[PDB]
Amino acid sequence: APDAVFGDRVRRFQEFLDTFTSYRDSVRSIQVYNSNNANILPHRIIISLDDLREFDRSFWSGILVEPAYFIPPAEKALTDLADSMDDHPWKLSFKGSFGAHALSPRTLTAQHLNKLVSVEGIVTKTSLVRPKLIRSVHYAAKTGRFHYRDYTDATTTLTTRIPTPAIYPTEDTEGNKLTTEYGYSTFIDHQRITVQEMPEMAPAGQLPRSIDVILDDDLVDKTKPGDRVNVVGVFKSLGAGGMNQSNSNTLIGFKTLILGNTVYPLHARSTGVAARQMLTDFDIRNINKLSKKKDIFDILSQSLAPSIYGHDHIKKAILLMLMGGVEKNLENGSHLRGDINILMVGDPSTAKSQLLRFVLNTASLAIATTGRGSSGVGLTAAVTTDRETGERRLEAGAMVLADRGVVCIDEFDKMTDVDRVAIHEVMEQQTVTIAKAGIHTTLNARCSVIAAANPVFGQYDVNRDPHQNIALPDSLLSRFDLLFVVTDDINEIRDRSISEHVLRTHRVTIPFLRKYVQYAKERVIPQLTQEAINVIVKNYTDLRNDDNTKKSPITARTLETLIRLATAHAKVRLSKTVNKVDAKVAANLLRFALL
Amino acid sequence: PLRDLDSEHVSKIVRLSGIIISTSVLSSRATYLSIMCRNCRHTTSITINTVSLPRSCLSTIESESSMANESNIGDESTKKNCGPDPYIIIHESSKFIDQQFLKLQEIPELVPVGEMPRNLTMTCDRYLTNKVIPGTR
Amino acid sequence: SIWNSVTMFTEEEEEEFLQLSRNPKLYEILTNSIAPSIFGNEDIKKAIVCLLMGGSKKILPDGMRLRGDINVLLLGDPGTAKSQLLKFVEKVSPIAVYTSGKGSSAAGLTASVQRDPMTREFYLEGGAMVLADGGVVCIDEFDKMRDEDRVAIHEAMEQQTISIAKAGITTVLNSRTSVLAAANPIYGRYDDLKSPGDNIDFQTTILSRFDMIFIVKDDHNEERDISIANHVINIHTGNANAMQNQQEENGSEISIEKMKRYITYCRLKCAPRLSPQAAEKLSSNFVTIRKQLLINELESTERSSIPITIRQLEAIIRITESLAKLELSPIAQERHVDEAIRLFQASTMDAASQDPIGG
Amino acid sequence: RVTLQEAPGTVPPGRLPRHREVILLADLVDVSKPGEEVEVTGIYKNNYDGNLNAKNGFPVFATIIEANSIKRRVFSWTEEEEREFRKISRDRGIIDKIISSMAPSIYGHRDIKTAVACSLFGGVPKNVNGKHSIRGDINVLLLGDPGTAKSQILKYVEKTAHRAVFATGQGASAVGLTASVRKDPITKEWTLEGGALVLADKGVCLIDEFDKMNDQDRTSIHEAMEQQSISISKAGIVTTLQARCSIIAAANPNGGRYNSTLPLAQNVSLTEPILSR
Numbered sequence A: 001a002p003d004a005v006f007g008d009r010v011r012r013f014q015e016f017l018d019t020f021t022s023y024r025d026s027v028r029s030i031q032v033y034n035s036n037n038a039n040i041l042p043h044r045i046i047i048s049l050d051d052l053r054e055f056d057r058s059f060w061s062g063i064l065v066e067p068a069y070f071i072p073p074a075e076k077a078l079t080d081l082a083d084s085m086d087d088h089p090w091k092l093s094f095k096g097s098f099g100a101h102a103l104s105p106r107t108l109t110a111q112h113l114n115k116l117v118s119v120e121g122i123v124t125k126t127s128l129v130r131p132k133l134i135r136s137v138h139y140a141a142k143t144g145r146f147h148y149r150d151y152t153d154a155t156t157t158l159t160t161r162i163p164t165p166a167i168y169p170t171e172d173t174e175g176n177k178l179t180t181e182y183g184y185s186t187f188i189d190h191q192r193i194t195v196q197e198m199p200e201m202a203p204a205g206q207l208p209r210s211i212d213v214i215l216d217d218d219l220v221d222k223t224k225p226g227d228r229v230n231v232v233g234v235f236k237s238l239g240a241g242g243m244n245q246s247n248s249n250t251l252i253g254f255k256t257l258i259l260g261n262t263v264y265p266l267h268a269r270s271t272g273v274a275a276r277q278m279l280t281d282f283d284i285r286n287i288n289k290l291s292k293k294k295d296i297f298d299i300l301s302q303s304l305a306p307s308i309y310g311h312d313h314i315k316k317a318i319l320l321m322l323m324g325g326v327e328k329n330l331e332n333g334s335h336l337r338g339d340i341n342i343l344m345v346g347d348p349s350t351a352k353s354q355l356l357r358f359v360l361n362t363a364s365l366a367i368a369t370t371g372r373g374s375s376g377v378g379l380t381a382a383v384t385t386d387r388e389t390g391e392r393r394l395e396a397g398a399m400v401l402a403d404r405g406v407v408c409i410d411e412f413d414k415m416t417d418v419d420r421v422a423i424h425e426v427m428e429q430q431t432v433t434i435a436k437a438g439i440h441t442t443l444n445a446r447c448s449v450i451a452a453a454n455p456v457f458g459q460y461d462v463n464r465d466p467h468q469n470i471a472l473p474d475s476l477l478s479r480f481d482l483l484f485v486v487t488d489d490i491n492e493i494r495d496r497s498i499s500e501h502v503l504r505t506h507r508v509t510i511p512f513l514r515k516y517v518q519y520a521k522e523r524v525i526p527q528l529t530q531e532a533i534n535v536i537v538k539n540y541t542d543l544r545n546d547d548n549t550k551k552s553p554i555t556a557r558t559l560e561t562l563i564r565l566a567t568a569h570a571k572v573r574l575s576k577t578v579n580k581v582d583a584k585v586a587a588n589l590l591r592f593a594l595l
Numbered sequence B: 001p002l003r004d005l006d007s008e009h010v011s012k013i014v015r016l017s018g019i020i021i022s023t024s025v026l027s028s029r030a031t032y033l034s035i036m037c038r039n040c041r042h043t044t045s046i047t048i049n050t051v052s053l054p055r056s057c058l059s060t061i062e063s064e065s066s067m068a069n070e071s072n073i074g075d076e077s078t079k080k081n082c083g084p085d086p087y088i089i090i091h092e093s094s095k096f097i098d099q100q101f102l103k104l105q106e107i108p109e110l111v112p113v114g115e116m117p118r119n120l121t122m123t124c125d126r127y128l129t130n131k132v133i134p135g136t137r
Numbered sequence C: 001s002i003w004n005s006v007t008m009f010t011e012e013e014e015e016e017f018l019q020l021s022r023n024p025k026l027y028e029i030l031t032n033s034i035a036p037s038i039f040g041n042e043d044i045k046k047a048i049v050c051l052l053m054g055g056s057k058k059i060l061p062d063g064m065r066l067r068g069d070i071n072v073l074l075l076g077d078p079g080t081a082k083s084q085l086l087k088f089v090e091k092v093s094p095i096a097v098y099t100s101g102k103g104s105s106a107a108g109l110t111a112s113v114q115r116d117p118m119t120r121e122f123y124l125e126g127g128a129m130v131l132a133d134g135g136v137v138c139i140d141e142f143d144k145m146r147d148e149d150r151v152a153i154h155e156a157m158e159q160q161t162i163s164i165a166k167a168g169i170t171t172v173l174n175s176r177t178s179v180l181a182a183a184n185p186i187y188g189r190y191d192d193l194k195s196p197g198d199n200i201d202f203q204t205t206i207l208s209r210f211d212m213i214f215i216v217k218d219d220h221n222e223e224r225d226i227s228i229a230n231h232v233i234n235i236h237t238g239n240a241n242a243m244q245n246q247q248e249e250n251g252s253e254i255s256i257e258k259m260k261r262y263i264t265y266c267r268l269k270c271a272p273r274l275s276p277q278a279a280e281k282l283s284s285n286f287v288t289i290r291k292q293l294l295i296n297e298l299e300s301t302e303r304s305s306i307p308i309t310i311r312q313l314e315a316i317i318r319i320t321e322s323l324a325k326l327e328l329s330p331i332a333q334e335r336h337v338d339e340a341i342r343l344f345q346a347s348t349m350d351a352a353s354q355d356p357i358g359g
Numbered sequence D: 001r002v003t004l005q006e007a008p009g010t011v012p013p014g015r016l017p018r019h020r021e022v023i024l025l026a027d028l029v030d031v032s033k034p035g036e037e038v039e040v041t042g043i044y045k046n047n048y049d050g051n052l053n054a055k056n057g058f059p060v061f062a063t064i065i066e067a068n069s070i071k072r073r074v075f076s077w078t079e080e081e082e083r084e085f086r087k088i089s090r091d092r093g094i095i096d097k098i099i100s101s102m103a104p105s106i107y108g109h110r111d112i113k114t115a116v117a118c119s120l121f122g123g124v125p126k127n128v129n130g131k132h133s134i135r136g137d138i139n140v141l142l143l144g145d146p147g148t149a150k151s152q153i154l155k156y157v158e159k160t161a162h163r164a165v166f167a168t169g170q171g172a173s174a175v176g177l178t179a180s181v182r183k184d185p186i187t188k189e190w191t192l193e194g195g196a197l198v199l200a201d202k203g204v205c206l207i208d209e210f211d212k213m214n215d216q217d218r219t220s221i222h223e224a225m226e227q228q229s230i231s232i233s234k235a236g237i238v239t240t241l242q243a244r245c246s247i248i249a250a251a252n253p254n255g256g257r258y259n260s261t262l263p264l265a266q267n268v269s270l271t272e273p274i275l276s277r
């Protein structure tokens, strides 16, 4: 029956929604889109706990400490507002500062039960999305009428209710037989996941802690295992902890879990989640203005890792790798690569690792690896596992996670043949093939690679040809688009200058650079032009028919590399077509790298 | 010494020394429960400080009011019987605590040769949880 | 460990530490305090003081991290008491792990990952390089260890992070640590007729990583032998247990626990920064050193076994900041640079035993 | 509950040793430990409960023995022995008197026997201001040609010492050399067990065939000898254990025969860091 407190809380939340007007127009926009586009959007809105606190502190604390009494009124108020303002029920999600209610699975104790919490962790295992039966519909042959029934369980609402275990109807009230209508029944999705403490925050040498989460309807497939997730939900207890009946066992307690209502994936270094930013009109105006200056490439290249001295060409190459080219697919089904790869060989104090870590820190999706750190299955994802459902399947590895991203390899020359043969396929076909007992599949691994290695004799020697100093298979070298050789030669003036630069350090910004690269990579797709065609033809002919000794061989991969660099420079320019200037820049850079 | 515990110490207070090797995860137990009978909606409460929920409805033995006697009968001659275990817990209005299990084993140095050591189980709760980690003496 | 430390100090402790800091003889008192039971090796002890103090870390706007720890290597003849220093440093530092190459019995040397015995999930099983985070690792027999450990340690000593990549886990850990390593020459004795590169038993490029190298030789000398013998028999007799220690504790020596607390206090409180005069002096010194090395190399037809790089410049910077810190001064003057350069010349520039260095 | 197995010696040729279960009550508990031969006087009776007779198959019954009396088929002293100790000590030549009394079943090897005496007695540890440790246990190494009674010497040391623990780098041994977390076959409980080094703290560890040892065992020996403490980080357990013990080892030269023309360092496969300790 109606309740006075319930009505008062409903009216108070209605006043809150009246004073704050953003959510009203958000709901109107959702309905407008769903009407116009018939894809359909769900009925859910996000509210600000900070605004709630500023408006009504008592109501704020009520939601925070006793959600079971304060949320359903708000949901009803939102539903009423939507149904009034239009020409399913709606749902709420919470953002803002949770204060002492932001915890981790280790610091989550019984004193938080029945309270709204926000946990952070790493998803360890997801469950299979199964439908749940809500309403059943039946048809009677003898009478030509349709009957129906409804079902519910304990986890569908916050407040406890008296169980009503209705049975599945097979007969009519009079004894007639019934026929089920699968097409007219109603089903809802359902999933369960587990969250664990992050590995970079849990104490070392101690076993981890974990907590279960239940998701329903439209929050059912928002994450994958191995992800960093922040979940805001209601910590709840269910059933009776062996109290009912004798149940002599006293070891077990009360089952607990979180009826999650908000899930957010978080980005982190060497993690499978791509970082994305929201672009404002101010950002777009600034980027578009900056596009028109001639030395844009120079300023952008210099912006990277300003703490390091020189290496201007290497910085340019890294920027080109970050921007990337374009990949082509033909109606036949053939695939043409569009990524770039970089290898650095140098003297043992040339900031190779510093640049590599900078790329790891700045790239939107990058994964870091060392020579012998990961071996065998860890790179190709060729591991096979199984659940208790009995089926075996695969769980992704380094390069598989690195799809559409970057892979940093440090101490490259320490690898082995068994995995260099594997990485050949990744660099060229951009694909991984697995054939084990009961598994025969093919996984996309479109990623770029940057690697560093040391010369055989400790220091690069000019008295010997490049082969004796590098000592890597020519087939492998052919796959790397760019190779650089860097040596430190003692010189009074250079040493002086590097000294002042380093002392200065020991006593365009990166976020804007990231926004720039995101927009450029997402929006612009240039095409080839006859001018560039001719320039690249001439340059490739000359390189293939010159006698100079080069640091790397020459194949058609070099021509494709010219194409990719020209396209990437055009992408930097944000022009819709490649140009003679871009072709010349690519040719100059490759010539410098080879000579 | 952990090897000298025997019958005479049952239910007494003892002092022991050892090394922690394993700590379980925190459990949940109830200290104040609010319960309701699912048939006649008779409510009550329980406080803990092996408690079990009532086996049968208490509204009969508890003659609260004169009108309660009438309410306990209706629809002609059918006697009122709520059934076995008619109570359900209301979780929105209950309080819980923390419980934990530990294992303690003799110092490996003094174990007799040729025999695996002896270990023992311990239970702690409330403010004695999350105080040590395995490997501590 | 770093997860159960204390970051609050009593007022009496703070006042006592301020009074001790104001002492002008604090440096000498600390040097005498480190391992009073060994004879000589004043430069080694001073290097250990600098190591325990540690430098100052910097975070740059672009994200580049300039580490602030110090790495020391002890090449030496057998039985020169170069292991007792390791053990004492372990015992005195607040967070320390002492281990040998190939790890310890049932304890790996680097971060290791395995499935949970119960839940079959990933978790860090151990590893000294991560257990000792924020502290000191005392590596003995540095010349015997596997290549994977070599690579992981090489990444740790500079980037202070360990990158993990496996079939179901990918993350970058934190391993802020200071490395004190001890190794023995091949053939059982250091030979003056061969380069230190040939005396060591691994890639000579590894020597480019450490900030200080101490090559200790066991020369034979009657009076030195007699003095050391007298010291050792005194220690065994126990007279040294009272003399020196129990008297110098009255003003001219520090208790081990008090020194530990003082190190923690200084670490948590102070973080010096250089001055332009020191900067210019350091730059001039570095340029002169590299000019001399280039002259000798161009004169010779071979490359030296002890190269000079920017790592050494940063090591000098870290050492001067370390010396400045223990006085709690928020700035370092050229008086600190003088001592830093003296220590550097004493320790690292024993490369004069290198052939193309001769000249 | 105890299990008694027939003594292997008495079994007639070609058959197997049988076994039975025994029940001990009250003060009869923890009177006999594994590895000793005992005589038990008790009552022989069925497991009359069994489980139940609804089981399929023949109606067979198990039997047990209820123990009434148990008997076995020392280093403490008194004033009478203490006065005799002092009297014997006051005599001259006591050192050689003792040395002549070691391993009487072996002929010669006076240097071996005196070294065993020294290592079996041991010195006194020292610690200056609690910041400079000096060990007091004496280590000996035996390096001899085949057929020299090194194993006999080690067995005598085991039989004579108060706390001696045996181990070997090859062959069957009741204990290994590395600490580990392992299941309990009967109680199904995880247990932390240290190596013979840890188990023999304040005692003596005997190692047979010292040169047939693998990487893990060599690392454990090196750690124990250098630091007298064994670290461990396994199954969420991070800790350190004391391993203050005296080591006696036996080995064989490379090729099975000593080459007197070369230094000892090149006659064995061990390495200086372990040899010097």
Ligand SMILES: Nc1ncnc2c1ncn2[C@@H]1O[C@H](COP(=O)(O)OP(=O)(O)OP(=O)(O)O)[C@@H](O)[C@H]1O
Residues within 6 Å of the ligand: D105, D106, D107, D144, D145, D146, D147, D148, D149, D150, D151, D152, D252
């Ligand atoms: N000097 C000796 N006096 C008496 N018996 C001896 C003597 N030397 C060896 N033996 C006996 O000869 C056999 C040699 O085997 P034993 O294992 O005891 O020798 P070992 O020197 O340890 O050699 P290894 O382990 O290489 O076989 C044993 O029976 C030992 O008792």
Ligand SMILES: Nc1ncnc2c1ncn2[C@@H]1O[C@H](COP(=O)(O)OP(=O)(O)O)[C@@H](O)[C@H]1O
Residues within 6 Å of the ligand: A307, A308, A309, A310, A347, A348, A349, A350, A351, A352, A353, A354, A502, C158, C310, C311
């Ligand atoms: N060109 C440079 N400019 C500024 N600093 C440099 C430069 N080259 C090297 N360094 C310094 O030298 C150190 C080299 O470390 P690392 O990157 O591990 O060496 P490498 O990359 O040669 O293996 C870095 O800490 C860096 O600060």
Ligand SMILES: Nc1ncnc2c1ncn2[C@@H]1O[C@H](COP(=O)(O)OP(=O)(O)O)[C@@H](O)[C@H]1O
Residues within 6 Å of the ligand: C037, C038, C039, C040, C076, C077, C078, C079, C080, C081, C082, C083, C084, C228, C231, C232
């Ligand atoms: N200068 C010294 N002063 C005092 N004791 C010394 C000295 N040099 C060596 N010792 C003695 O040598 C022992 C240390 O030997 P060890 O640690 O094996 O040498 P190393 O560390 O070079 O391997 C100690 O017991 C110590 O008393």
Ligand SMILES: [Mg+2]
Residues within 6 Å of the ligand: A351, A352, A353, A354
């Ligand atoms: Mg590097």
Ligand SMILES: [Mg+2]
Residues within 6 Å of the ligand: D150, D151, D152
């Ligand atoms: Mg033998």
Ligand SMILES: [Zn+2]
Residues within 6 Å of the ligand: B037, B038, B039, B040, B041, B042, B057, B058, B059, B082, B086
């Ligand atoms: Zn009832």
